[PDB]
Amino acid sequence: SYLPPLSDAQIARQIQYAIDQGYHPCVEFNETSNAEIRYWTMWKLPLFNCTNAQDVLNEVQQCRSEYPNCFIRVVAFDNIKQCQVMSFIVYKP
Amino acid sequence: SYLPPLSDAQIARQIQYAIDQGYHPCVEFNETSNAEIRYWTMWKLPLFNCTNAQDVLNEVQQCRSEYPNCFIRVVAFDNIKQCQVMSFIVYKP
Amino acid sequence: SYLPPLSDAQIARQIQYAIDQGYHPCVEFNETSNAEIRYWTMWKLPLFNCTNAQDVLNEVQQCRSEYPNCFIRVVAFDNIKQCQVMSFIVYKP
Amino acid sequence: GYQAGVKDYRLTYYTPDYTPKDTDILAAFRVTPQPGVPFEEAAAAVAAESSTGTWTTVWTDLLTDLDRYKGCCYDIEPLPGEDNQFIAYIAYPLDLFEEGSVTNMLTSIVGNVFGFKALKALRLEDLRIPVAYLKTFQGPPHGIQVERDKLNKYGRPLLGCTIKPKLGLSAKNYGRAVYECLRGGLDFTKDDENINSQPFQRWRDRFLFVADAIHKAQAETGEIKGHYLNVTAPTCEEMLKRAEFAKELEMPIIMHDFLTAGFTANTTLSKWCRDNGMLLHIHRAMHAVMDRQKNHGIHFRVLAKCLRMSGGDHIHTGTVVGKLEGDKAVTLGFVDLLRENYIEQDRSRGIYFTQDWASMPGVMAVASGGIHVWHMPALVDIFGDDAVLQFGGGTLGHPWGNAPGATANRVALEACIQARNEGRDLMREGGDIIREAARWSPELAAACELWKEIKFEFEAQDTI
Amino acid sequence: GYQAGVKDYRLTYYTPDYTPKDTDILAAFRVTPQPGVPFEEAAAAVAAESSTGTWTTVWTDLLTDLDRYKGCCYDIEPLPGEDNQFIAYIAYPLDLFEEGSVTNMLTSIVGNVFGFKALKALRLEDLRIPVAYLKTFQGPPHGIQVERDKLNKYGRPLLGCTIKPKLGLSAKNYGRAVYECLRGGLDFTKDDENINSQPFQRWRDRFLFVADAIHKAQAETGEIKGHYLNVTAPTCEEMLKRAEFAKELEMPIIMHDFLTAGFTANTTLSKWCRDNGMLLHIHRAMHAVMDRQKNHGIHFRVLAKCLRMSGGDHIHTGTVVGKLEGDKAVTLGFVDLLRENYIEQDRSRGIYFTQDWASMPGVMAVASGGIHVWHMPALVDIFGDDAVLQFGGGTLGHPWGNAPGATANRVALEACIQARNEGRDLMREGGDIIREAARWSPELAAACELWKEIKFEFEAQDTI
Amino acid sequence: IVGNVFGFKALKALRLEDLRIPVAYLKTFQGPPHGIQVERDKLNKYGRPLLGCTIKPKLGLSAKNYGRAVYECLRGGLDFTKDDENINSQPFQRWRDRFLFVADAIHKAQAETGEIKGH
Ligand SMILES: O=C(O)[C@@](O)(COP(=O)(O)O)[C@H](O)[C@H](O)COP(=O)(O)O
Numbered sequence A, B, C: 001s002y003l004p005p006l007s008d009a010q011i012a013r014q015i016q017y018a019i020d021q022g023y024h025p026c027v028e029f030n031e032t033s034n035a036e037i038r039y040w041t042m043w044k045l046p047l048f049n050c051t052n053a054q055d056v057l058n059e060v061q062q063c064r065s066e067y068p069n070c071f072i073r074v075v076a077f078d079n080i081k082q083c084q085v086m087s088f089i090v091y092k093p
Numbered sequence D, E: 001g002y003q004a005g006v007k008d009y010r011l012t013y014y015t016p017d018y019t020p021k022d023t024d025i026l027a028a029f030r031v032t033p034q035p036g037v038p039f040e041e042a043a044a045a046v047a048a049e050s051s052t053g054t055w056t057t058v059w060t061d062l063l064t065d066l067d068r069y070k071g072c073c074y075d076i077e078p079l080p081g082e083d084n085q086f087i088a089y090i091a092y093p094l095d096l097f098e099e100g101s102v103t104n105m106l107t108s109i110v111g112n113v114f115g116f117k118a119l120k121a122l123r124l125e126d127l128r129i130p131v132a133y134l135k136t137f138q139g140p141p142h143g144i145q146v147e148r149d150k151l152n153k154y155g156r157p158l159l160g161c162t163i164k165p166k167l168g169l170s171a172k173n174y175g176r177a178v179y180e181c182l183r184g185g186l187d188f189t190k191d192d193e194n195i196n197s198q199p200f201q202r203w204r205d206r207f208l209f210v211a212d213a214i215h216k217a218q219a220e221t222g223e224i225k226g227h228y229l230n231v232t233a234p235t236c237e238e239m240l241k242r243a244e245f246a247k248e249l250e251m252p253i254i255m256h257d258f259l260t261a262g263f264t265a266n267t268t269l270s271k272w273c274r275d276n277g278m279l280l281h282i283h284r285a286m287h288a289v290m291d292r293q294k295n296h297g298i299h300f301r302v303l304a305k306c307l308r309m310s311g312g313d314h315i316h317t318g319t320v321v322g323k324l325e326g327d328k329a330v331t332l333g334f335v336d337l338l339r340e341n342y343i344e345q346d347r348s349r350g351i352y353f354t355q356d357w358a359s360m361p362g363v364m365a366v367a368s369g370g371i372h373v374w375h376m377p378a379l380v381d382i383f384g385d386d387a388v389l390q391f392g393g394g395t396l397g398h399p400w401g402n403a404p405g406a407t408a409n410r411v412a413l414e415a416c417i418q419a420r421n422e423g424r425d426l427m428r429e430g431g432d433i434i435r436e437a438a439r440w441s442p443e444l445a446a447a448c449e450l451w452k453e454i455k456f457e458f459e460a461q462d463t464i
Numbered sequence F: 001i002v003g004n005v006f007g008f009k010a011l012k013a014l015r016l017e018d019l020r021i022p023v024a025y026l027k028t029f030q031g032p033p034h035g036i037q038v039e040r041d042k043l044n045k046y047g048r049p050l051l052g053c054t055i056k057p058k059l060g061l062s063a064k065n066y067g068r069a070v071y072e073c074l075r076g077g078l079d080f081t082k083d084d085e086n087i088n089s090q091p092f093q094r095w096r097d098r099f100l101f102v103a104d105a106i107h108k109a110q111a112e113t114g115e116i117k118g119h
């Protein structure tokens, strides 16, 4: 959030990095992007075993169309360590 | 103490049993035989590696001569479990 | 008390040592020599500025004559540090 | 039976045929004997006087089972590249140690042996803490995973500033600097290790104004903010009084100087932190008194293991590249021992023993001291995500002040993260990434210009 | 105004024309700089990074009065007999320090400076603690004078035995050995430093049986007896729980391992001891990790001053002649610093600063470790009356056992006292006095024969 | 381990026979407050099994009658006496009354025999 807004190629490059590490991408959305909000609403289910970053971007677009008034972010988690290993906002309403 | 007083042969037989089990005999004395008395006074040192019960009886006699006004008992301990495994009064003043 | 009883020459030699250091001798007595007894009864007053050890022994003798059934000891104190610097029994009843 | 008198320690305490149990505590001692003292005798003295034995034979040994209680040297490793040195490997039975007591463990192993006349020097290099003993300790109040979940911060190292000057600022001025650092983009600010309660600034006044600063900066930025309020104190009661006030103010994090306060106080605080949901930042003040020299003292990796057991959520680990010493090989080793669940023996990184932590939570590494924006690519590359990078002078010494100083560091970090996540080599493209980001950030540009020539390059004492 | 960037520490922190105030804390640091670092710059870095300064200029300095808060090197003393060493004298204003906090004082002065890249080594040799700061500390719970008055023991050193083996004895066996030592003529027995609470012996069982042993031995001998029950613990709550039980059992004395437990816990305990009339014996376990080597660490005299301030009634001071290192010159100096009210500067005994204690009570010196009956004349001569002489193996390792072992030591001491009070030279007539007393004491005779050949003679590391 | 599995429809019966408790888990438990060795040391009783009597009838005795039975049992050579398992606090005998009278009985039996007594 302290860097210039990311392009679609930069976003996909961040997502691909997660996939390459073996992390599992997931899409979530909320009306506010405030960090005091503990839980965002999960979009469908986490994309387990997605090898393509475009498939993740596809779910972002589908989420945006249904919820244009909501913030959307992409998260990835390590199931072995059971921790979230990345989180960045992909869409501001 | 609820049985008839022990003879010297019975006492030596009790002591030999301890030795045969690998326990270490020791002689202690006190002015009172009350069980509320936590510590009696140790006579010399515990007889480590005594194979003869008579050697234990010898130390009892030597203790009795120096302290005829004191109770005397023989104890044996297991050093592996670190616990006292027998105790019986051998002389009442 | 773990040494052989002191002779009058040994006692006077202990007292003289105190005087030579600048300590102030004092004589006290009690019916018991037990250390749980906090206070003994003071004989007269402390001998301030006594340069002669015999003068201290003189007060011991006078105390013994009046109280033959009491323990007597000689103490010396440092008034600058305000602490007792020696104490030994000189007479057992 | 009982044989009175002095005999050689090695007769009882050197056992080269002993195979360590999985329940034994293992110690690796770098031993320098006095001339004419055989290695076996020196090693046996260390084993004896850190477990069951004394200088002469005691009869009371025979009341018990000395053979199952004694420590023993089971291996000796000569160090031919050194002057009259060897490693003594010593095994201690589980039963010797008080459950959950770092204090007791250290009292036995390092209590008396370092002053033995027959040695010139002695250094404890490593300890293997068995799983059965580890289960008796709480460990960190929270640990890396839980901390990230409590703070809702993921995917990057965290950032902090230490307020400067170390001492002399008023409580109101302190809080002002905190608000400015935090609003500028830092996650954390902190009390200096020696800020406790003093004539120029009393602790309760500080705690209050810092809480105001956090609330303002959190509301303005929309990010969760914290400040490590130092609860280090004269007494345990005073330490807990300060922790309780931070809790009353709903502060997310406190700090503690574990060695200067001590392990008994620290273990008390770690339990309190677990009981109260408080994050615990640990400052390692005084460590270099013990851990710097190769020939004598206690290696930091041992102090770090002890801290993980006693408990802390963050611990200072050095910077490698900053104003304070930290060999890279040595550092990467003890960073792993602090963060990971299973660490394989690796002498190239000073790991003498394989260490299984049995699901004891990991500790966040903290890189702090003499670092600035130019060091960012190296700091990210060395420490990875699970670290906190702290800039005191590197923030407050910025040409334009605190808020720009903070933004400079935050931009620098986030640029280093993006670049790394794009597959770029931070050790090769380091300067390029910083220069690229400087175009977009005048704060960064100004920070880069000021500290271009500033490097700390000296020979390290504590090396493999 | 504000000038951002790095400049030399010496520009602000080296002040050779400064005259120390009577309220300043003074530090004497033995400094070994890296090659190419000027003495003045190294000394100024130490002064800066232990007080107010950091590696670069901060604007916040200008909010305050840096000149009245900064530490400063006011004198540099080259050491031409050494390799690249000098003494840096540093003055710290009173306002920098938290009242009654040894923890805070050490955090500032020794917190970070020992790991500075620009130094090869650093040792804190001495501290001058001003009277105004001392008045903020309780000091010893009781001190020498009050302790002697509470125990009703005068005119001689006190005597103790450490129970052995260190670990492995049952609580009942422990109490048995205590009764035997005490009835034999010793004033005190003690837990080993590493006896806390363990699988082979839980603390409450020990405390109970030891209390029984004291009561029996006190009733039989008519002398007041004690046993230092070790309250060293994992947490402050557990430490105080153990101290409280000793109080409930009406025990006169407890012990504490001040460095392994730490200064925060120790200061808590010292206050509790004052509040409860409990005598406090202090074990210095771990000290040699920090204090042995000349080039690096913290001299024991500093740790000893810190202990006197935090509080303890006894502290271990070494033996000189026993199994653990203790140079005679160095020892006599810090023994004076622990016991006396006014100690004049004396570099021949390592006393860098004149120390006024402002009526803070003195601490009993404790000589312990590898000593036996032959050492008695030397121990009496070195330490004088206000000391406790402790014999572990020297009692329990006696040919006939504990009670004779105790009597051997008690006879040996009382003979050495009588002889000294007769004007005899203990250093000349040492062996003669022991031999004279041996005629009357078969216990002593047996002890003398067993340990005739036993001497500990090695070159000391910690020397002037 | 035994929470839900015993009522599983797919089973007719289930019995847990044994558990191997690992050393690492055991170290998280206090275990006995004292155990065999320490108890003997506390009671000063070695070399033989200990002896006790349960006061009967199980229920229905007054506190004072309970104490009388305790004194008599203990003075006669038993180390211990005991409350029946279902003697807690009841209309026929309230616990605090029992505790007091039993303490009186122990003190008297212990003084007369010179052996340590308990209930
Ligand atoms: O007091 C200081 O010097 C610091 O606040 C750094 O300030 P700057 O950021 O201004 O340098 C840190 O406490 C030290 O780095 C501690 O060292 P370590 O982490 O090695 O224990």
Ligand SMILES: O=C(O)[C@@](O)(COP(=O)(O)O)[C@H](O)[C@H](O)COP(=O)(O)O
Binding pocket: D049, D054, D055, D112, D115, E162, E164, E192, E193, E284, E285, E316, E317, E318, E319, E323, E324, E366, E367, E368, E369, E370, E371, E390, E391, E392, E393, E394
């Ligand atoms: O554990 C030990 O070795 C001792 O009990 C001595 O036992 P012995 O009497 O049997 O030798 C003392 O704690 C050390 O002397 C401490 O050293 P210091 O006083 O120098 O701190």
Ligand SMILES: [Mg+2]
Binding pocket: D162, D191, D192, D193, D194
């Ligand atoms: Mg700091």
Ligand SMILES: [Mg+2]
Binding pocket: E162, E191, E192, E193, E194
């Ligand atoms: Mg010891």
Ligand SMILES: [Mg+2]
Binding pocket: F054, F083, F084, F085, F086
């Ligand atoms: Mg029943």
